[PDB]
Design a protein around this ligand. Sequence first.
Ligand code: MG
Ligand code: MG
Ligand code: MG
Ligand code: MG
Lengths: 22, 550, 486, 139, 139, 137, 136, 137
Amino acid sequence: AAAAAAAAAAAAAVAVAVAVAA
Amino acid sequence: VGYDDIGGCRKQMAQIREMVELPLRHPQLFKAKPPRGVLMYGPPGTGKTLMARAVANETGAFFFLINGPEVMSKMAGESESNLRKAFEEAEKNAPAIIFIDEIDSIAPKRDKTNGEVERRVVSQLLTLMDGMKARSNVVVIAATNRPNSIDPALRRFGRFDREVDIGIPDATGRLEVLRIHTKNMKLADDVDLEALAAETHGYVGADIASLCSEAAMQQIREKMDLIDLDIDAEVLDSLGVTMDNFRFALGNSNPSALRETVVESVNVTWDDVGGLDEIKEELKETVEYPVLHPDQYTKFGLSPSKGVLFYGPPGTGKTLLAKAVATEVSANFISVKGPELLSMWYGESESNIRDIFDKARAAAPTVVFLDELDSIAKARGGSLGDAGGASDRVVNQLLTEMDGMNAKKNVFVIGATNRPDQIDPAILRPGRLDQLIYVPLPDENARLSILNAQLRKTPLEPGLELTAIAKATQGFSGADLLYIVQRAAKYAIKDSIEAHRQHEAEKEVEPEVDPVPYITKEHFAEAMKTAKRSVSDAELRRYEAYSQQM
Amino acid sequence: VGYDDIGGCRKQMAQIREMVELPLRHPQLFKAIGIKPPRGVLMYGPPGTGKTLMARAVANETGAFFFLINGPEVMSKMAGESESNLRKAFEEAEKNAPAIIFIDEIDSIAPKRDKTNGEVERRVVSQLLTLMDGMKARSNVVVIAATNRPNSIDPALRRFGRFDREVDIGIPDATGRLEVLRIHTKNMKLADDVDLEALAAETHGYVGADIASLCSEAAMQQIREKMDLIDLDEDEIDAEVLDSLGVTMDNFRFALGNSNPSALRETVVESVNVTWDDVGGLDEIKEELKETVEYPVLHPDQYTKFGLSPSKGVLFYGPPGTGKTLLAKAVATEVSANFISVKGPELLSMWYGESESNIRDIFDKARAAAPTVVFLDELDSIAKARGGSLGDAGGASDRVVNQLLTEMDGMNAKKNVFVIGATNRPDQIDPAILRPGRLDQLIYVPLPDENARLSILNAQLRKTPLEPGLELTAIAKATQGFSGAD
Amino acid sequence: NGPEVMSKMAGESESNLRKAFEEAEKNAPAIIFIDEIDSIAPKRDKTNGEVERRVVSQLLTLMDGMKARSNVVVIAATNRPNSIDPALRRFGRFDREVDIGIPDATGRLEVLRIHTKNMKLADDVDLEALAAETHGYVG
Amino acid sequence: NGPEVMSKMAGESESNLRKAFEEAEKNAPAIIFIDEIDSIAPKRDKTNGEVERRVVSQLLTLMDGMKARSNVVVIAATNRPNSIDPALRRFGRFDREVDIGIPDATGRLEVLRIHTKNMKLADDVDLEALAAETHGYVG
Amino acid sequence: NGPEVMSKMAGESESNLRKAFEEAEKNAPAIIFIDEIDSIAPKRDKTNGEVERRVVSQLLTLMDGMKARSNVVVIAATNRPNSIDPALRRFGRFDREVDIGDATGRLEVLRIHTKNMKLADDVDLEALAAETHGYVG
Amino acid sequence: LSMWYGESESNIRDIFDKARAAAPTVVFLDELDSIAKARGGSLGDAGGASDRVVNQLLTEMDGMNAKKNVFVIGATNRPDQIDPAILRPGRLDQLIYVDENARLSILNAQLRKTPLEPGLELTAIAKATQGFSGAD
Amino acid sequence: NGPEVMSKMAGESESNLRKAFEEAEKNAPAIIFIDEIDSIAPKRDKTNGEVERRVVSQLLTLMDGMKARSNVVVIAATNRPNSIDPALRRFGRFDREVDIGDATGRLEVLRIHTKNMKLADDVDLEALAAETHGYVG
Ligand SMILES: [Mg+2]
Ligand SMILES: [Mg+2]
Ligand SMILES: [Mg+2]
Ligand SMILES: [Mg+2]
């Protein structure tokens, strides 16, 4: 008989940065 | 359940008869070649399974049902055994018809799925569909709820040639399905299905059945809770569904597509929005004609505007008008605030805006209220795309999904912003959000109307005057007037509570309705001592400059 | 358990009772009206509200056999074995008798069929859809489901024919809490002093299991206050102390003062000991705040008699240290309504959208456990005038202030949530926030006068030994420009 | 232990949890200690996998569902309570939360006495001075 | 090694760590060396995944827990101590953090003497001057 | 290759690197060319992804450690050598840094690239070596 | 435009890259005055952005040889505020100056797919409206 | 074709590619037609699988390994001109692309298709080939 298997690795996120003007 | 049970899809049904019924009883005229498979797609609850059962019943051809997710097994390779045994029995017995329900369980695009039994069964099914002699004339019936999650290998010539978009019905289709479902039950005479179909907008296929069942349920409760039947022949035969049951069911029910986005009830009327008479007239002119008089559109030959933008100082009634439209327009309404859709993950934000607009198109006609557009449709500027171009991608998706709404879609977008300066000018281009209504500060008569609309449900002193209040409040706003009324009410409540305290004190040491019966002259006089203007003059100057620039 | 155990939900009780009883008590009536009844219902609401209790009551009362399915329980390791489990359950239920299926924690079995990426999961979703709808879909079988997050369910399952009615098992009213208290305080023995009406009145966000916890804690306090006089008595406990326990009203008061609503358990404020007598001066401000906070929560009949709505927001502004945060602490300690203490920049986050997600979560908790008090310290940190920032982090501050605007005034209800702001720089606050209907009361807290400095000094010396001959009038007369901090 | 329950097979972590709870319940009134619960039981709304959500649901129904429990007490230990599913922070599942916090001067003196009771100490030791001078020590 | 234990399936990296620890403890008293631990175990609060949190919790439970260790010594090596879970930097897990920093002039002298022990050198060169001249060279 | 070995599955790119190093060490003394190493060395402080730090630690483990390398030399390739880890630019891993950045060499490349074909008799390579002043090779 | 150093120039740079990639093409720059603004002197962040935009436009238009044959079309209402540095010879030298008959043709082209009344003449609207435009 | 290269056997894809390339090099100087290359080459950045990367690397190392004595060319058809690897569009494998943006072929396709039916007696397929502009296949 056959069998299944589960797998959950990761994803991709988004960051936000702050800048300084002059 | 024969061919006469499915309704509202005469044209789509007509192709089905031509596609599978006529070429199956006589292949001579086609030879003098019908496909070996037909796909049906559309929103859930559109009579797919109903049509499959009607064709299965009306034609005496043998029927072998293989539910999509029920072909696999635990033992090694028994899924393949099931599938080829199904096809071989379908061929060997007779020129049969096979119906595969929920194909998505069998063909998950072969792009994300990394299993092995799924690959084996999909490839074997492809080979089986390849092998079909033209003489057997057996055809397969497929039923998918979501058409874009299909293995494109099946979407090729010789494999499921012609698809049939079983969509939502029109008004006539809704009336037809209403009749079909309500013909068995005993419907009282004082009922006209035409009105119910003209008021029913987004319901499709099964939701109409839900409506009828709910109305019947309410009637049964009306004739069970009161009588207290606790068998009773006289109670049994005295059952008839009247109009109020259907009205209640319509007021309680919701299109299944908009089930997730149920909105809290805020009942507003057009007499609650004091003032803004011309604005209300223009809004009605814009929203009721495209949805009720298509003949006018056909005669004119001019595309009506499919958007509008409210802008003005805070506390003027933009959200109030949005609420009034949501409650008393006789069409669907999905409210969204700007920041709700954004998500930290990659793609989710665009998937969410895509899903919301898909729901809007599904429950057509709809009115999508974008409140505070200054957060999702901000000016492009020089932000550098510090968030991986997330904001840029969101605005780009919004533009592509707002410009791709043809006339048939009938989706009206309501905009409302406090600061129009940060709106991307691309939005204001014609064809997306052309019309822009400006909500100015109330005048004296508008202020009087606002006060009368806000003091509608408030017991008020018979000897009272409001023109004085109107004349005094000069640069005030609707929110400011609300503040005045609430402060006066709070003073009245304070007087009531202290008076009740005193009365109880010398009572314990039949009561009237209250020691203080009405809002009083002195209550308003003291409430008006602490009323300050909401918006200053600088904002008024800037809004006037923007208006004059337009 | 029975139908007299579930309390605080009468409409929903009738809604499920109808579906469970009428098609199994008067089938002739439904054949006479002609149509079949709905045969699918989904129970949803916050956790610990009574959905599983109602399912248990239905299972005990209805005379047919009852099958219970926990969510993840169906799945198994062998390929296509969960499908077999679901098929076996449904076929046995149909074959044996007319029956009620109960699917506990449906969120585990219907993960939207679009965001999931596991094939077996989408196989189980499709199998459930087929079993609940299709050829010979049902023959006198009804399915009840329970969930805490109904929006995470595949819409195909939420269609007529599969799940016709969605019952909302929500937070109870004061009468609901009174009913729950009367239900849970029956078997136990109470002293005459107990007043369940007052207990329900001062309970503000407790739902179901919260009330149960309150009762249990009260009993625990009684047992742990009336066992010290006796020894441990490990061998046996004698009848004279075994009898006459009597869970007192002081025990109930203590248990109510210790506990907090389950919703606000994540944002429980640290205990602070301030009182109205601890705040010197500001007589008009304290009385205005007291009447504006206690009127809607204690006297709703007058508001409904006038049919208007109460004032919600308030903004303190003035020089630093004048007593704004002190007033907020006094409100937190004295007022009966729940307190949500949040700092200014606490809720911001580096990710995209998580600031507004946090704001939405905080305000959702506030309106869930209503009546609630939310303190926004230094509103000028998060709510600044829009468009000023030439260079910004993708306009995150603008999005935050817009989120605040829409949540404090938008397409929502007025569940009695009071926003208090405390900032010493009212020039940086955006004008939209200061509109009436969002923050309508701008209270200026000026520098103390002579009698206010005297009151402050006495308030701060209320727990300190002092010289008998010492008078504070000279100190007050000598500090002219001073503040409370000075 | 926290991650001891998870397995590669789909639908096996919940099977392990079920076996553990049934074995615990079949015997006398027992105690189940779950160490490092931040791993088993995260918030379902914030997580993105599927097996963790299913494990959380299995744990929830085992803790409080129809036929809830029979004289079985569950103890949990964690370093972060805010990263736990709100449905688990409820009466019936985890009704009472004890806060094991930093000791004070007397507590630290007790800890010193306990930890210096089995060794061969000198006569010159005053544990009071040590408990005074040690300030932020967690024990 | 650091990344050698990680996997894609749910519940396999923790199984690898359990196998390693139990194999080590089965035999005579042993030494375990987790090279580049900072890759395995970053701060839990500042990570988005789930497998990293589970493996961090597994390390915590393995080193500290009911019947944690018996004659088994654990050694670690890292370059970024501050980027480690503070719950890991406690007595009972990593009792003392030895700072293996750059050597002094004498230390560099011994390093030169050690390295130049096998190659045939000429008499003229004196390693003391070289050690004095080198300042920042390490190992 | 750089972007080829990197994947989204946890513990697979490190497994691919370990398989490549085991394949290079099983048969013979060979030459390893890891191309575009700047994409898989984000200096462990500017990046946010865990898989990049995990494969950085895998490279530092496979290049140096207990019985790390047995008669095998590794070669790298990058455009900006400043975005590499300081433990990677150490002795034993990348102990030699070669700057491969003129007219006679360009003429040599023209002579060796036109060797297997008879172009003509009157073609002068001086103008072809002087006019293509910005050709990399 | 972009209130950032690089972006507001990268847009024009990759616009001209898309233009030179699909040769031949026509780049219709509508409302030139809003872009150029005669950079001159403004002494601010907006002045610096305008000067950088004008310098990017000049250095990405003057680099067009006989190859790639691009063609820039401009249109404006106010010709006063356009930069004489962009009206110079060698970059953009043509000046096309742009009535009743054109108004009648515009009214007849706008009313093509319209069910008009047969008893109606548009010459009265053409004669009454003199200084109007197609948008109005 | 594109998706006809996978089999249950592990590594069959690479063996099938090597078999096809060695058959085309063994038989004659010939031409290989790879239709629908967008399935084999998933652009290598948006994909997450591992056998797709392996079959793309096999097609890369098999297209590059053609010497002068092979004398074989390859032809490849695609639908979208954007979902192709630049490593596949690099100099050496695919550099000469055509942009097929007629009436005679449409009349030929009409006379191919409609010649198997009892059609009519008063039909002119030249008008059907002329008035049809954008149809294909
Ligand atoms: Mg169906
Ligand atoms: Mg509004
Ligand atoms: Mg429950
Ligand atoms: Mg303060």
